[PDB]
Design a protein around this ligand. Sequence first.
Ligand SMILES: [Mg+2]
Ligand SMILES: [Mg+2]
Ligand SMILES: [Zn+2]
Ligand SMILES: [Zn+2]
Lengths: 91, 55, 69, 211, 102, 117
Amino acid sequence: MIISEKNRREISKYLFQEGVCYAKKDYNLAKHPLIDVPNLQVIKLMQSFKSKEYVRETFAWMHYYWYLTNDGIEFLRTYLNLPSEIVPATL
Amino acid sequence: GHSNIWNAHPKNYGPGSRTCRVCGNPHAIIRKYGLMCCRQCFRSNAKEIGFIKYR
Amino acid sequence: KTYTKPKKIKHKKKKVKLAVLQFYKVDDSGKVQRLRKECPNAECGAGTFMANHFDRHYCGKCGLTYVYQ
Amino acid sequence: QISKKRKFVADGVFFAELNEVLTRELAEDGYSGVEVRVTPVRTEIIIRATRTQNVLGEKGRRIRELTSVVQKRFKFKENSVELYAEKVNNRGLCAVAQAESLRYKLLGGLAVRRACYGVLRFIMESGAKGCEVIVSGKLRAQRAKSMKFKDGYMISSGQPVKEYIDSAVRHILMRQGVLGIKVKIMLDWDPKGKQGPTTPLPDLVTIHSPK
Amino acid sequence: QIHKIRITLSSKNVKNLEKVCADLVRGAKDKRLRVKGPVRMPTKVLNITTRKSPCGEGTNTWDRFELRVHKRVIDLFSSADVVKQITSITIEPGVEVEVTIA
Amino acid sequence: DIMTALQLVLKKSKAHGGLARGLHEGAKVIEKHAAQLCVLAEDCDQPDYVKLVKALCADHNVSLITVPNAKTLGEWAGLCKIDSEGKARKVVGCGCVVVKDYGEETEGLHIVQEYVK
Ligand SMILES: [Mg+2]
Ligand SMILES: [Mg+2]
Ligand SMILES: [Zn+2]
Ligand SMILES: [Zn+2]
């Protein structure tokens, strides 16, 4: 899916800073409740991350639940150019 | 589709503006007390919700 | 299923070998001259040109159009 | 600022949704159930499982992730909802745990009869007055059939069923279709109430021995 | 420094609500405070009647689902600090306690 | 060390994502006055391309550096797929590269700034 660079940066930043993220299955929602990006782009970016094992996806009662993995943490650290010391708030 | 066309039809009321919060189906929604669950899902989750059968 | 009219083909952008190259002219002394206008819009900023249409000037970023007679 | 009716209904809906979310997330880890306790400016959620090491993870990373995602999804104030993982006492007396164990055994290729008999024996050796396990679906053939295993006491009618019977239902996704597993465990009277109902059966009369 | 403190207790379990009301009343009495109540409001019975079948086949049979909400009102004539101390006693789950003035 | 310094600076900028590639974007970024440096590949078959690059860089007072091979410049710009075996394959030549922000100070930045001056 075509995603603006700023939107992808914001999504990745939020995911790494928090380590978890949810999303209601609403493709046409204007903005994600926690992220300024539209809901569809957040859902599809998380699906892309899950497809290559960067995140774990759980679905229940029309909602998504994404949890970052070690490979996902490494990818986000490399891509965001953050120092190795900084880690997701969950740890 | 085009932004002004894709999903542009108003959905402020009617069966198409509401769905089951458990399964997303738009049919047989129980709106009483704000449950917003379809009758099947509500009958499945009634005990957890706190609804008891006395008669 | 059966179809009556020929299948429609989605729009594909035409390819220009060097669209930027024709937006500037360089003299022997080294001075650079721009052969197309620049959008006055602040958001577009400098370096953003406007198309030279046969009745108006069109900006591809903000969509601002100026008609000349 | 909502009415009491809507408040209680929303509390029940939140409990149901949280239970479903935990069941989906903690399937393999084991999830007997959850309890929600509300306190002034603090809500406590206790996760019951047979394997709290998996639920907590290494240094509580998994439980912290669950707490964060629950707080974000349910709009809880930050540092206001916290999760706890507790051991389930007498897991053999929990219908959900036994159903999950049977699901795991069946998904591993174990024969249905052997797994069901083992589950029945484990339940009975755990102090259950009786138990019943039903397996339904396509077993050994394209024609669906039901398998019933039973031992001990069992009641099915009247009010005491709601307290003396613990039951669960689970689906197993096999290669050729879904398998339906039902676990029904009859508890035993417990004066303390920890391991069973704190009420005797209606038609049980005890006469004290005369001096 | 005396005010009519209003305490509203709501719960789905009668036993826990009654025990909490009794504990609050005894705590107020132990401090020589004036207690009015507890006043039992009419029980609220939320009712939902839904068809048993997940389809349209068979005899139309219906499930009567009820959720009962019990509300209690207690009035104390004392200061805010003493009532706050009294209400600090342990409260079992399922009982909501709200404290207000008048 | 000048070539190594330039490569290090370009790689760090790419990691920070503060660099632009191509003339169609290079001219725009340079005209924004946010371009702090320009790099041009010598292996160019279009005299107008190099003439325009040099004229714009001189007019806008932007540091200019030259590279012999355009494919090497593209590789240093990240226009390739890195394989675990070794050097990245599927390379595409990049005629010009521009820098908007260096992200952070580096050893090669000082060498490049000393050389270009
Ligand atoms: Mg009987
Ligand atoms: Mg009878
Ligand atoms: Zn439903
Ligand atoms: Zn413009």
